[model samples]
Target: YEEVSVSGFEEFHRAVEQHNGKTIFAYFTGSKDAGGKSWCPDCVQAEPVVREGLKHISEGCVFIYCQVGEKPYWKDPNNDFRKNLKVTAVPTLLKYGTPQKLVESECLQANLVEMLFSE
Candidate 1:
């Protein structure tokens, strides 16, 4: 599988810490083909950008990745996020929190840094 430069978990944790109580949710998802197969050009191209972005934005949000049938944590029987977020697509980005918002960035194109810091 393609390697993700960004540590989604780590970035989320740091974000939570930086916010210090502000509510933020960063959700990302991909299919098993994307998460487990490096041959998938879609995965290869998307993963690195997300990973690198995490290095810069982890200190103010929570990151979640829903891998479809790839990782044990993201299998079908236990698709926690699918039920919770009503996910119906392979790649979806959802955000919700203070300021109360939702965004779907196919390629993580929502300009997160500005969103996080802006008033």
Candidate 2:
């Protein structure tokens, strides 16, 4: 991953789900590409929106960052992140625990993103 920065998300799996408590948002973005950028176009677009959303989460929630991996690997039909998480697409936002929600692609606008985090 091309990040000189911090990640609210981790490389955790289903094994870590129990530790996530009753509130969590699993952000599954495309695997990091060259320069640590996301190979998925939608992921690049959704990044900022999700970041803003997390900032406004009033209640406690675990945000997991699941980078899906490189291009060639991801395109494979059996990619782990895809199969294990049941991810349909990159930039997928799946909220687990209470007050659950799911949104991806065009729905990741500021207002919608904020709504997912609002208690």
Candidate 3:
């Protein structure tokens, strides 16, 4: 299982395009603060469960942990992620280029996380 971490829009675009043709699962979370932790409680809550759920991901699928940016940046309605990805919330997990997505609190549940990856 290979994991790729990207911060902001540019990196996300680069990594995702580079991994094209694979099953791409993108987990979007609030950006980290000075102490290296996310400000979003739901992202924190979903972290470990998503980590554990990775085992259920089919072979050769790529998992991307994406930090959407700081509070102000993310709050902007014109942000790239919001404008392009249609991600209106933090802790969003989606299979890139597809309709499959889980938003907000849904990312915190272990069962849903596993199902997302397995399916």
List CA RMSD, all candidates: 7.3, 4.9, 1.0
What is the per-residue lDDT of model 1 for residues 8-62, given as tens digits with 9 covering 90 to 100? 3345444445655643444454444534553234544555555555555535445
Q: What digit string (tens of lDDT, one per residue) describes model 3 on residues 1-119?
A: 68999999999999989989888999999988888867788888888888899989999899999999998999999999999989999899999999889898888888898989997
Top-scoring candidate (lDDT): 3
lDDT of candidate 1 at residue 82, scale 0 to 100: 57
Local distance difference test values of all predictions, in order: 0.45, 0.63, 0.91
Top-scoring candidate (TM-score): 3
What shift in Å separates residue 44 of candidate 3 from its native position after superposition? 0.7
Q: Could you tell me the C-alpha RMSD of candidate 2 in Å?
A: 4.9
Clashing pairs in 1: 6-51, 15-58, 15-59, 15-60, 15-61
Arranged by lDDT, best first: 3, 2, 1
TM-score of each: 0.43, 0.73, 0.95
